[PDB]
Design a protein around this ligand. Structure first.
Ligand SMILES: C=CC1=C(C)/C(=C/c2[nH]c(/C=C3N=C(/C=C4\NC(=O)C(C)=C4C=C)C(C)=C\3CCC(=O)O)c(CCC(=O)O)c2C)NC1=O
Length: 243
């Protein structure tokens, strides 16, 4: 999963670079297998009437994680995006790790990270609640309220505009902490019952359906590739509904 030869990495916002490295480091020694995206996608570029969008995809799986997708993107010279989701295998009932960072010439505008529930009661498993609580409440000067579709995110969801380098680093460290908890819980998780697996699958389906309501992503994709491409990308590459 080496990022050493990434074409985008050298030109991305430093917070995005550090987060990409931290995600890759978390995954590096796992029992990884490739996950083939639709059309074996790995790098793509598109332009219509405006700026070009350039995307680099990395995607893996393990027995506990159905799909581990790290996607870096740049629109034109200055708009930088990191997208990451670890989709759980429903059999093990783990939450969804996700993060999104958007940055421009004015710095990072949006930083989101969560471990999101899949249970019918919309709660994280008890072990996650406990480990997350023990991190303490992080201090951020510019909190942002989630849009309605963001009901899918846990009570521990971060959504901020970082105010300075200190906050950028605090946010990255909290994502590192989330990944450490997630990787640990994955090694103590056992296969669940058919009824429980079903429940968790539905939580993941709902997560994907709600993520597809995000017009901030959709507009960026549409401006570079058009409506049909954006719909296929969001529904098949980013947030595939398992069935
Ligand atoms: C893949 C391509 C991709 C694009 C083009 C993208 C764009 C993107 N996402 C954004 C917001 C956002 N992004 C998210 C969250 C997520 N988004 C996610 O993909 C995941 C996994 C999460 C959460 C774990 C949220 C909650 C917002 C704010 C939405 C809003 O303000 O309405 C914004 C607005 C930034 C701002 O208001 O400062 C843009 C331009 N994000 C992307 O990932």
């Amino acid at each position: 999963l080496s990022l050493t030869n990434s074409s985008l990495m050298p030109t991305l916002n430093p917070m995005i670079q550090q987060l990409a490295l931290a995600i890759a480091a978390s995954w590096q020694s796992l029992p990884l297998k490739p996950y083939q995206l639709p059309e074996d996608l790995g790098y793509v570029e598109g332009r219509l009437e405006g700026e070009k969008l350039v995307i680099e995809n990395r995607c893996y799986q393990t027995p506990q994680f159905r799909k581990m997708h790290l996607q870096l993107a740049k629109v034109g010279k200055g708009l930088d995006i990191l997208h990451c989701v670890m989709f759980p295998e429903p059999l093990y009932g783990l939450p969804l790790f996700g993060c999104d960072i958007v940055a421009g010439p004015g710095g990072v505008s949006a930083a989101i990270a969560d471990l999101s529930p899949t249970q019918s009661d919309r709660q994280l498993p008890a072990a996650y609640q406990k480990s997350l609580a023990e991190l303490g409440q992080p201090e951020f000067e510019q909190q942002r309220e989630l849009p309605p579709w963001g009901e899918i995110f846990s009570e521990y969801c971060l959504f901020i505009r970082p105010s300075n380098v200190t906050e950028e680093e605090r946010f990255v460290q909290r994502v590192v902490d989330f990944l450490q908890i997630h990787c640990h819980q994955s090694i103590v998780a056992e296969p669940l019952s058919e009824a429980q697996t079903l429940e968790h699958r539905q939580g993941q389906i709902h997560y994907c359906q709600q993520q597809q309501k995000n017009d901030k992503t959709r507009r960026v994709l549409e401006k570079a590739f058009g409506e049909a491409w954006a719909e296929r990308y969001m529904s098949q590459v980013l947030f595939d509904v398992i069935q």
